[PDB]
Amino acid sequence: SKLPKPVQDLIKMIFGPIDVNYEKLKTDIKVVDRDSEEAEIIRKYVKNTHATTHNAYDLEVIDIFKIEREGECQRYKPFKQLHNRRLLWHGSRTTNFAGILSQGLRIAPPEAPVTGYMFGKGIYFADMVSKSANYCHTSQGDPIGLILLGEVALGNMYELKHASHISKLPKGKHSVKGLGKTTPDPSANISLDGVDVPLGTGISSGVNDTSLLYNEYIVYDIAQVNLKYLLKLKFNF
Ligand SMILES: NC(=O)c1cccc2[nH]c(-c3cccc(C(=O)N4CCn5c(nnc5C(F)(F)F)C4)c3)nc12
């Protein structure tokens, strides 16, 4: 195999023929240099946005891959100049990833139980790395999970303090923002490739009347998303 070792180990993790397995993903995976500025930005995003009620583990980046799914860029194109783009987290159980890369992130079917989906059937993201890492569900026996960074064209946000359970946005809105009591420090956000990186440390958002501790970002068209990076994570408890 001509693949770089990190890519081969990631292939092993997601699938359990290494190059055939890699081709099965229909995804161009490349490794990010440990000494680059891209990597430093991603690691600072991980460092500063670890919530304080998620102190059961202590994160630690292992590998950082830049991923490009086939068609995802030409499918995301129409929503690109859409203002308010943000680079956000998405966690999921490891076995799901072999699919997430081949099919992309998807929405629950049109007739599933909308209960459990606090803000209706959509694609969810968080600006606190730990809020998403919780969904990797990585225990002490298997303390390695995968988490995605995605450019999300949030557009005009419908800001909500409580649950809705509906997937229909008031015309003029492109995404939902569940307002958390704690938000990344906006005085520290940067703009990487024109995408807003909210890597600021956790501060108080100023909203008292709200159900969520940390912000949630939901979209409802799967083409509002563009997966940029993929992270191997060591969970230390
Ligand atoms: N994980 C986050 O980054 C995340 C961040 C903030 C709020 C959130 N709410 C939910 C959520 C809300 C409702 C249902 C589920 C849930 O069972 N899955 C659906 C399937 N699936 C999951 N994680 N990935 C996927 C998949 F779409 F790729 F298949 C878990 C998950 N996930 C988040």
PDB file of C-alpha atoms and ligand atoms in Angstrom:
ATOM      1  CA  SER A   1       0.000   0.000   0.000  1.00  0.00           C
ATOM      2  CA  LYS A   2       1.182   3.507  -0.889  1.00  0.00           C
ATOM      3  CA  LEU A   3      -1.043   5.234   1.675  1.00  0.00           C
ATOM      4  CA  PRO A   4       0.608   7.131   4.541  1.00  0.00           C
ATOM      5  CA  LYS A   5       0.577   5.237   7.821  1.00  0.00           C
ATOM      6  CA  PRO A   6      -1.944   7.506   9.632  1.00  0.00           C
ATOM      7  CA  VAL A   7      -4.405   7.059   6.767  1.00  0.00           C
ATOM      8  CA  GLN A   8      -3.980   3.278   6.905  1.00  0.00           C
ATOM      9  CA  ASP A   9      -4.545   3.190  10.671  1.00  0.00           C
ATOM     10  CA  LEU A  10      -7.655   5.346  10.239  1.00  0.00           C
ATOM     11  CA  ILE A  11      -8.888   2.953   7.543  1.00  0.00           C
ATOM     12  CA  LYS A  12      -8.389   0.116  10.033  1.00  0.00           C
ATOM     13  CA  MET A  13     -10.298   1.981  12.743  1.00  0.00           C
ATOM     14  CA  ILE A  14     -13.295   2.799  10.565  1.00  0.00           C
ATOM     15  CA  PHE A  15     -13.488  -0.617   8.847  1.00  0.00           C
ATOM     16  CA  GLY A  16     -12.391  -2.917  11.693  1.00  0.00           C
ATOM     17  CA  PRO A  17      -7.377  -4.948   1.651  1.00  0.00           C
ATOM     18  CA  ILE A  18      -6.454  -1.489   2.940  1.00  0.00           C
ATOM     19  CA  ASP A  19      -6.435   0.425  -0.354  1.00  0.00           C
ATOM     20  CA  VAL A  20      -9.708  -1.139  -1.513  1.00  0.00           C
ATOM     21  CA  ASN A  21     -11.212  -0.057   1.806  1.00  0.00           C
ATOM     22  CA  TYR A  22      -9.891   3.484   1.305  1.00  0.00           C
ATOM     23  CA  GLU A  23     -11.371   3.619  -2.200  1.00  0.00           C
ATOM     24  CA  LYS A  24     -14.672   2.396  -0.743  1.00  0.00           C
ATOM     25  CA  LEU A  25     -15.071   5.779   0.992  1.00  0.00           C
ATOM     26  CA  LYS A  26     -15.102   7.915  -2.183  1.00  0.00           C
ATOM     27  CA  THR A  27     -13.227  10.498  -0.105  1.00  0.00           C
ATOM     28  CA  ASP A  28      -9.816  12.104  -0.587  1.00  0.00           C
ATOM     29  CA  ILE A  29      -8.096  11.891   2.810  1.00  0.00           C
ATOM     30  CA  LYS A  30      -4.799  13.673   3.446  1.00  0.00           C
ATOM     31  CA  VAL A  31      -2.770  14.166   6.613  1.00  0.00           C
ATOM     32  CA  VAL A  32      -2.261  17.607   8.169  1.00  0.00           C
ATOM     33  CA  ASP A  33       1.316  18.454   9.125  1.00  0.00           C
ATOM     34  CA  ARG A  34       1.799  18.480  12.894  1.00  0.00           C
ATOM     35  CA  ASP A  35       3.851  21.710  12.642  1.00  0.00           C
ATOM     36  CA  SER A  36       1.585  23.656  10.265  1.00  0.00           C
ATOM     37  CA  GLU A  37      -0.609  26.625  11.143  1.00  0.00           C
ATOM     38  CA  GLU A  38      -3.732  24.681  10.147  1.00  0.00           C
ATOM     39  CA  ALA A  39      -2.900  22.108  12.820  1.00  0.00           C
ATOM     40  CA  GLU A  40      -2.180  24.758  15.454  1.00  0.00           C
ATOM     41  CA  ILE A  41      -5.537  26.412  14.742  1.00  0.00           C
ATOM     42  CA  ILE A  42      -7.390  23.099  15.021  1.00  0.00           C
ATOM     43  CA  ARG A  43      -5.587  22.212  18.253  1.00  0.00           C
ATOM     44  CA  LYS A  44      -6.349  25.627  19.764  1.00  0.00           C
ATOM     45  CA  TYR A  45     -10.005  25.160  18.821  1.00  0.00           C
ATOM     46  CA  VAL A  46      -9.893  21.840  20.680  1.00  0.00           C
ATOM     47  CA  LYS A  47      -8.037  23.328  23.655  1.00  0.00           C
ATOM     48  CA  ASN A  48     -10.142  26.414  24.345  1.00  0.00           C
ATOM     49  CA  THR A  49     -13.651  25.053  23.643  1.00  0.00           C
ATOM     50  CA  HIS A  50     -13.713  22.162  26.153  1.00  0.00           C
ATOM     51  CA  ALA A  51     -16.779  22.703  28.335  1.00  0.00           C
ATOM     52  CA  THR A  52     -16.429  22.480  32.111  1.00  0.00           C
ATOM     53  CA  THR A  53     -19.306  20.082  32.817  1.00  0.00           C
ATOM     54  CA  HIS A  54     -17.589  17.623  30.431  1.00  0.00           C
ATOM     55  CA  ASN A  55     -14.719  17.031  32.858  1.00  0.00           C
ATOM     56  CA  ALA A  56     -15.126  13.244  32.806  1.00  0.00           C
ATOM     57  CA  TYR A  57     -12.385  13.014  30.160  1.00  0.00           C
ATOM     58  CA  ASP A  58      -9.513  15.124  28.831  1.00  0.00           C
ATOM     59  CA  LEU A  59      -9.186  15.357  25.058  1.00  0.00           C
ATOM     60  CA  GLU A  60      -5.942  15.061  23.098  1.00  0.00           C
ATOM     61  CA  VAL A  61      -5.596  15.238  19.314  1.00  0.00           C
ATOM     62  CA  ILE A  62      -3.855  12.244  17.724  1.00  0.00           C
ATOM     63  CA  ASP A  63      -4.177  12.873  13.982  1.00  0.00           C
ATOM     64  CA  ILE A  64      -5.710  15.634  11.869  1.00  0.00           C
ATOM     65  CA  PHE A  65      -6.820  14.794   8.332  1.00  0.00           C
ATOM     66  CA  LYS A  66      -8.099  17.131   5.649  1.00  0.00           C
ATOM     67  CA  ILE A  67     -10.951  15.279   3.935  1.00  0.00           C
ATOM     68  CA  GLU A  68     -12.750  16.125   0.693  1.00  0.00           C
ATOM     69  CA  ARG A  69     -15.797  14.066  -0.266  1.00  0.00           C
ATOM     70  CA  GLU A  70     -16.610  13.664  -3.945  1.00  0.00           C
ATOM     71  CA  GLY A  71     -19.301  16.087  -5.082  1.00  0.00           C
ATOM     72  CA  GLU A  72     -19.611  17.707  -1.652  1.00  0.00           C
ATOM     73  CA  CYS A  73     -17.926  20.898  -2.871  1.00  0.00           C
ATOM     74  CA  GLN A  74     -20.008  21.259  -6.043  1.00  0.00           C
ATOM     75  CA  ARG A  75     -23.082  20.411  -3.943  1.00  0.00           C
ATOM     76  CA  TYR A  76     -22.171  23.017  -1.305  1.00  0.00           C
ATOM     77  CA  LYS A  77     -21.319  25.681  -3.925  1.00  0.00           C
ATOM     78  CA  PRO A  78     -24.802  27.316  -4.083  1.00  0.00           C
ATOM     79  CA  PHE A  79     -24.631  28.069  -0.331  1.00  0.00           C
ATOM     80  CA  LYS A  80     -21.048  29.356  -0.275  1.00  0.00           C
ATOM     81  CA  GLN A  81     -21.474  33.134  -0.492  1.00  0.00           C
ATOM     82  CA  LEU A  82     -24.263  32.611   2.068  1.00  0.00           C
ATOM     83  CA  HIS A  83     -22.972  34.835   4.870  1.00  0.00           C
ATOM     84  CA  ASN A  84     -22.307  33.533   8.396  1.00  0.00           C
ATOM     85  CA  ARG A  85     -20.259  30.440   7.645  1.00  0.00           C
ATOM     86  CA  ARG A  86     -18.842  28.660  10.685  1.00  0.00           C
ATOM     87  CA  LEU A  87     -16.414  25.787  11.245  1.00  0.00           C
ATOM     88  CA  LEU A  88     -18.191  23.550  13.753  1.00  0.00           C
ATOM     89  CA  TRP A  89     -17.871  20.164  15.447  1.00  0.00           C
ATOM     90  CA  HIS A  90     -19.810  16.975  14.809  1.00  0.00           C
ATOM     91  CA  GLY A  91     -19.369  13.802  16.836  1.00  0.00           C
ATOM     92  CA  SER A  92     -20.633  10.312  16.099  1.00  0.00           C
ATOM     93  CA  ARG A  93     -19.941   6.728  17.090  1.00  0.00           C
ATOM     94  CA  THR A  94     -16.867   5.437  15.295  1.00  0.00           C
ATOM     95  CA  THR A  95     -18.605   2.747  13.226  1.00  0.00           C
ATOM     96  CA  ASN A  96     -20.864   5.410  11.691  1.00  0.00           C
ATOM     97  CA  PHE A  97     -17.869   7.101  10.073  1.00  0.00           C
ATOM     98  CA  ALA A  98     -17.264   4.465   7.395  1.00  0.00           C
ATOM     99  CA  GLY A  99     -20.674   5.637   6.175  1.00  0.00           C
ATOM    100  CA  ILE A 100     -20.459   9.359   6.942  1.00  0.00           C
ATOM    101  CA  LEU A 101     -17.516   9.622   4.552  1.00  0.00           C
ATOM    102  CA  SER A 102     -19.152   7.630   1.748  1.00  0.00           C
ATOM    103  CA  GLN A 103     -22.648   9.136   1.998  1.00  0.00           C
ATOM    104  CA  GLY A 104     -21.940  12.349   3.911  1.00  0.00           C
ATOM    105  CA  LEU A 105     -23.931  13.621   6.849  1.00  0.00           C
ATOM    106  CA  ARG A 106     -27.657  13.007   6.442  1.00  0.00           C
ATOM    107  CA  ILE A 107     -30.998  13.805   8.069  1.00  0.00           C
ATOM    108  CA  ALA A 108     -33.321  11.298   9.722  1.00  0.00           C
ATOM    109  CA  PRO A 109     -35.986   9.959   7.320  1.00  0.00           C
ATOM    110  CA  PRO A 110     -39.177  11.966   6.734  1.00  0.00           C
ATOM    111  CA  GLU A 111     -41.211   9.627   8.981  1.00  0.00           C
ATOM    112  CA  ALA A 112     -39.171   8.905  12.102  1.00  0.00           C
ATOM    113  CA  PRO A 113     -40.114   9.934  15.669  1.00  0.00           C
ATOM    114  CA  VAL A 114     -39.365  13.653  15.842  1.00  0.00           C
ATOM    115  CA  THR A 115     -39.139  13.335  19.620  1.00  0.00           C
ATOM    116  CA  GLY A 116     -35.522  13.106  20.703  1.00  0.00           C
ATOM    117  CA  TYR A 117     -34.640  15.608  17.965  1.00  0.00           C
ATOM    118  CA  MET A 118     -34.774  18.724  20.137  1.00  0.00           C
ATOM    119  CA  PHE A 119     -34.827  21.007  17.083  1.00  0.00           C
ATOM    120  CA  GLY A 120     -36.455  18.639  14.597  1.00  0.00           C
ATOM    121  CA  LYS A 121     -34.871  16.289  12.067  1.00  0.00           C
ATOM    122  CA  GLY A 122     -31.711  18.012  10.903  1.00  0.00           C
ATOM    123  CA  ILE A 123     -27.927  18.006  11.030  1.00  0.00           C
ATOM    124  CA  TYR A 124     -26.542  19.118  14.397  1.00  0.00           C
ATOM    125  CA  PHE A 125     -23.265  20.812  15.307  1.00  0.00           C
ATOM    126  CA  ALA A 126     -21.659  22.382  18.368  1.00  0.00           C
ATOM    127  CA  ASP A 127     -19.048  25.083  18.924  1.00  0.00           C
ATOM    128  CA  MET A 128     -17.798  23.327  22.095  1.00  0.00           C
ATOM    129  CA  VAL A 129     -15.609  20.388  21.062  1.00  0.00           C
ATOM    130  CA  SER A 130     -16.618  18.375  24.130  1.00  0.00           C
ATOM    131  CA  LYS A 131     -20.352  18.656  23.421  1.00  0.00           C
ATOM    132  CA  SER A 132     -19.749  16.787  20.158  1.00  0.00           C
ATOM    133  CA  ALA A 133     -17.043  14.457  21.488  1.00  0.00           C
ATOM    134  CA  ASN A 134     -19.607  13.149  23.977  1.00  0.00           C
ATOM    135  CA  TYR A 135     -21.398  11.590  20.991  1.00  0.00           C
ATOM    136  CA  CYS A 136     -18.333   9.542  20.040  1.00  0.00           C
ATOM    137  CA  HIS A 137     -19.273   7.432  23.087  1.00  0.00           C
ATOM    138  CA  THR A 138     -15.665   6.377  23.692  1.00  0.00           C
ATOM    139  CA  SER A 139     -15.105   4.551  26.981  1.00  0.00           C
ATOM    140  CA  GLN A 140     -11.947   3.632  28.895  1.00  0.00           C
ATOM    141  CA  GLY A 141     -11.755   0.297  27.086  1.00  0.00           C
ATOM    142  CA  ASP A 142     -11.877   2.079  23.710  1.00  0.00           C
ATOM    143  CA  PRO A 143     -10.847   5.698  24.364  1.00  0.00           C
ATOM    144  CA  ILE A 144     -10.331   6.607  20.685  1.00  0.00           C
ATOM    145  CA  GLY A 145     -13.045   8.262  18.616  1.00  0.00           C
ATOM    146  CA  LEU A 146     -13.460  10.370  15.498  1.00  0.00           C
ATOM    147  CA  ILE A 147     -14.881  13.896  15.283  1.00  0.00           C
ATOM    148  CA  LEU A 148     -15.543  16.045  12.214  1.00  0.00           C
ATOM    149  CA  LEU A 149     -14.941  19.712  11.533  1.00  0.00           C
ATOM    150  CA  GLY A 150     -17.407  21.095   9.018  1.00  0.00           C
ATOM    151  CA  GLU A 151     -17.991  24.388   7.262  1.00  0.00           C
ATOM    152  CA  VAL A 152     -21.674  25.164   7.850  1.00  0.00           C
ATOM    153  CA  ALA A 153     -23.535  27.880   5.931  1.00  0.00           C
ATOM    154  CA  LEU A 154     -25.658  28.965   8.874  1.00  0.00           C
ATOM    155  CA  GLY A 155     -27.116  31.940   7.025  1.00  0.00           C
ATOM    156  CA  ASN A 156     -29.867  33.783   8.876  1.00  0.00           C
ATOM    157  CA  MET A 157     -30.070  32.047  12.248  1.00  0.00           C
ATOM    158  CA  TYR A 158     -33.384  31.368  13.972  1.00  0.00           C
ATOM    159  CA  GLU A 159     -32.307  31.698  17.600  1.00  0.00           C
ATOM    160  CA  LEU A 160     -34.219  29.532  20.072  1.00  0.00           C
ATOM    161  CA  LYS A 161     -33.933  29.109  23.839  1.00  0.00           C
ATOM    162  CA  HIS A 162     -36.170  26.017  24.127  1.00  0.00           C
ATOM    163  CA  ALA A 163     -37.057  22.934  22.117  1.00  0.00           C
ATOM    164  CA  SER A 164     -39.221  23.031  18.994  1.00  0.00           C
ATOM    165  CA  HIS A 165     -39.244  19.501  17.496  1.00  0.00           C
ATOM    166  CA  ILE A 166     -40.120  20.926  14.050  1.00  0.00           C
ATOM    167  CA  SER A 167     -38.061  20.829  10.846  1.00  0.00           C
ATOM    168  CA  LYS A 168     -39.744  23.823   9.157  1.00  0.00           C
ATOM    169  CA  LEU A 169     -37.967  27.167   9.308  1.00  0.00           C
ATOM    170  CA  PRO A 170     -39.839  30.482   9.078  1.00  0.00           C
ATOM    171  CA  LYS A 171     -39.248  31.675   5.527  1.00  0.00           C
ATOM    172  CA  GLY A 172     -36.122  33.826   5.609  1.00  0.00           C
ATOM    173  CA  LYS A 173     -34.147  31.514   7.925  1.00  0.00           C
ATOM    174  CA  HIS A 174     -31.557  28.923   6.908  1.00  0.00           C
ATOM    175  CA  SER A 175     -30.516  27.391  10.246  1.00  0.00           C
ATOM    176  CA  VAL A 176     -31.419  27.181  13.931  1.00  0.00           C
ATOM    177  CA  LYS A 177     -29.192  28.284  16.810  1.00  0.00           C
ATOM    178  CA  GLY A 178     -30.031  26.841  20.201  1.00  0.00           C
ATOM    179  CA  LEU A 179     -28.695  29.536  22.512  1.00  0.00           C
ATOM    180  CA  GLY A 180     -26.399  28.196  25.212  1.00  0.00           C
ATOM    181  CA  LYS A 181     -25.640  29.956  28.475  1.00  0.00           C
ATOM    182  CA  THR A 182     -21.937  29.547  27.609  1.00  0.00           C
ATOM    183  CA  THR A 183     -20.501  30.527  24.229  1.00  0.00           C
ATOM    184  CA  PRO A 184     -16.992  30.745  22.761  1.00  0.00           C
ATOM    185  CA  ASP A 185     -15.428  34.167  23.276  1.00  0.00           C
ATOM    186  CA  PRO A 186     -16.308  36.142  20.110  1.00  0.00           C
ATOM    187  CA  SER A 187     -13.421  38.573  20.681  1.00  0.00           C
ATOM    188  CA  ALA A 188     -11.122  35.664  19.728  1.00  0.00           C
ATOM    189  CA  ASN A 189     -12.856  34.258  16.633  1.00  0.00           C
ATOM    190  CA  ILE A 190     -10.781  34.229  13.454  1.00  0.00           C
ATOM    191  CA  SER A 191     -11.632  33.773   9.755  1.00  0.00           C
ATOM    192  CA  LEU A 192      -9.927  30.739   8.199  1.00  0.00           C
ATOM    193  CA  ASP A 193     -10.506  30.706   4.422  1.00  0.00           C
ATOM    194  CA  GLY A 194     -13.445  33.045   5.010  1.00  0.00           C
ATOM    195  CA  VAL A 195     -15.065  30.545   7.407  1.00  0.00           C
ATOM    196  CA  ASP A 196     -15.636  31.850  10.928  1.00  0.00           C
ATOM    197  CA  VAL A 197     -13.642  29.796  13.451  1.00  0.00           C
ATOM    198  CA  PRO A 198     -15.062  30.431  16.986  1.00  0.00           C
ATOM    199  CA  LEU A 199     -12.038  29.126  18.889  1.00  0.00           C
ATOM    200  CA  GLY A 200     -12.532  31.574  21.754  1.00  0.00           C
ATOM    201  CA  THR A 201     -12.549  30.351  25.331  1.00  0.00           C
ATOM    202  CA  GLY A 202     -15.892  29.699  26.981  1.00  0.00           C
ATOM    203  CA  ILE A 203     -17.591  32.789  28.403  1.00  0.00           C
ATOM    204  CA  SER A 204     -21.129  33.658  29.461  1.00  0.00           C
ATOM    205  CA  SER A 205     -23.427  34.354  26.516  1.00  0.00           C
ATOM    206  CA  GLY A 206     -25.682  36.571  28.644  1.00  0.00           C
ATOM    207  CA  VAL A 207     -28.863  34.510  28.161  1.00  0.00           C
ATOM    208  CA  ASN A 208     -30.397  33.351  31.444  1.00  0.00           C
ATOM    209  CA  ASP A 209     -33.758  32.093  30.129  1.00  0.00           C
ATOM    210  CA  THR A 210     -32.593  29.125  28.066  1.00  0.00           C
ATOM    211  CA  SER A 211     -32.588  25.331  28.203  1.00  0.00           C
ATOM    212  CA  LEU A 212     -29.112  24.730  26.750  1.00  0.00           C
ATOM    213  CA  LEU A 213     -25.761  25.065  28.485  1.00  0.00           C
ATOM    214  CA  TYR A 214     -23.870  25.357  25.185  1.00  0.00           C
ATOM    215  CA  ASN A 215     -24.945  26.474  21.743  1.00  0.00           C
ATOM    216  CA  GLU A 216     -26.291  24.059  19.149  1.00  0.00           C
ATOM    217  CA  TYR A 217     -26.296  24.771  15.404  1.00  0.00           C
ATOM    218  CA  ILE A 218     -28.837  22.889  13.277  1.00  0.00           C
ATOM    219  CA  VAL A 219     -29.273  22.952   9.505  1.00  0.00           C
ATOM    220  CA  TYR A 220     -31.970  21.253   7.453  1.00  0.00           C
ATOM    221  CA  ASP A 221     -30.551  20.934   3.923  1.00  0.00           C
ATOM    222  CA  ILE A 222     -27.608  18.545   3.741  1.00  0.00           C
ATOM    223  CA  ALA A 223     -25.932  20.804   1.156  1.00  0.00           C
ATOM    224  CA  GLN A 224     -25.388  23.525   3.781  1.00  0.00           C
ATOM    225  CA  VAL A 225     -22.475  21.393   5.035  1.00  0.00           C
ATOM    226  CA  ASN A 226     -18.931  20.862   3.771  1.00  0.00           C
ATOM    227  CA  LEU A 227     -16.784  18.442   5.776  1.00  0.00           C
ATOM    228  CA  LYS A 228     -13.262  19.894   5.997  1.00  0.00           C
ATOM    229  CA  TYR A 229     -11.294  17.931   8.623  1.00  0.00           C
ATOM    230  CA  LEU A 230     -11.406  14.688  10.602  1.00  0.00           C
ATOM    231  CA  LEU A 231      -9.774  14.147  13.990  1.00  0.00           C
ATOM    232  CA  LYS A 232      -8.569  11.137  15.941  1.00  0.00           C
ATOM    233  CA  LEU A 233      -9.035  11.856  19.641  1.00  0.00           C
ATOM    234  CA  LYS A 234      -7.559  10.309  22.780  1.00  0.00           C
ATOM    235  CA  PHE A 235     -10.034  10.429  25.676  1.00  0.00           C
ATOM    236  CA  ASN A 236      -8.170  10.519  29.003  1.00  0.00           C
ATOM    237  CA  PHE A 237     -10.259  10.092  32.147  1.00  0.00           C
TER     238      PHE A 237
HETATM  239  N1  LIG B   1     -23.267  15.008  17.613  1.00  0.00           N
HETATM  240  C1  LIG B   1     -23.177  16.331  17.564  1.00  0.00           C
HETATM  241  O1  LIG B   1     -22.241  16.908  17.000  1.00  0.00           O
HETATM  242  C2  LIG B   1     -24.258  17.133  18.217  1.00  0.00           C
HETATM  243  C3  LIG B   1     -23.976  18.419  18.684  1.00  0.00           C
HETATM  244  C4  LIG B   1     -24.954  19.199  19.293  1.00  0.00           C
HETATM  245  C5  LIG B   1     -26.248  18.724  19.457  1.00  0.00           C
HETATM  246  C6  LIG B   1     -26.528  17.446  18.988  1.00  0.00           C
HETATM  247  N2  LIG B   1     -27.697  16.704  18.965  1.00  0.00           N
HETATM  248  C7  LIG B   1     -27.405  15.523  18.352  1.00  0.00           C
HETATM  249  C8  LIG B   1     -28.416  14.489  18.073  1.00  0.00           C
HETATM  250  C9  LIG B   1     -29.766  14.815  18.005  1.00  0.00           C
HETATM  251  C10 LIG B   1     -30.701  13.851  17.671  1.00  0.00           C
HETATM  252  C11 LIG B   1     -30.297  12.554  17.404  1.00  0.00           C
HETATM  253  C12 LIG B   1     -28.951  12.209  17.475  1.00  0.00           C
HETATM  254  C13 LIG B   1     -28.515  10.810  17.177  1.00  0.00           C
HETATM  255  O2  LIG B   1     -28.893   9.897  17.889  1.00  0.00           O
HETATM  256  N3  LIG B   1     -27.706  10.602  16.118  1.00  0.00           N
HETATM  257  C14 LIG B   1     -28.232  10.552  14.745  1.00  0.00           C
HETATM  258  C15 LIG B   1     -27.310   9.754  13.836  1.00  0.00           C
HETATM  259  N4  LIG B   1     -25.962  10.323  13.973  1.00  0.00           N
HETATM  260  C16 LIG B   1     -25.429  10.675  15.177  1.00  0.00           C
HETATM  261  N5  LIG B   1     -24.224  11.171  15.034  1.00  0.00           N
HETATM  262  N6  LIG B   1     -23.932  11.155  13.667  1.00  0.00           N
HETATM  263  C17 LIG B   1     -24.985  10.648  13.062  1.00  0.00           C
HETATM  264  C18 LIG B   1     -25.084  10.478  11.572  1.00  0.00           C
HETATM  265  F1  LIG B   1     -25.948  11.327  11.034  1.00  0.00           F
HETATM  266  F2  LIG B   1     -23.922  10.689  10.973  1.00  0.00           F
HETATM  267  F3  LIG B   1     -25.478   9.256  11.237  1.00  0.00           F
HETATM  268  C19 LIG B   1     -26.274  10.440  16.381  1.00  0.00           C
HETATM  269  C20 LIG B   1     -28.014  13.180  17.815  1.00  0.00           C
HETATM  270  N7  LIG B   1     -26.129  15.440  17.989  1.00  0.00           N
HETATM  271  C21 LIG B   1     -25.564  16.649  18.378  1.00  0.00           C
END
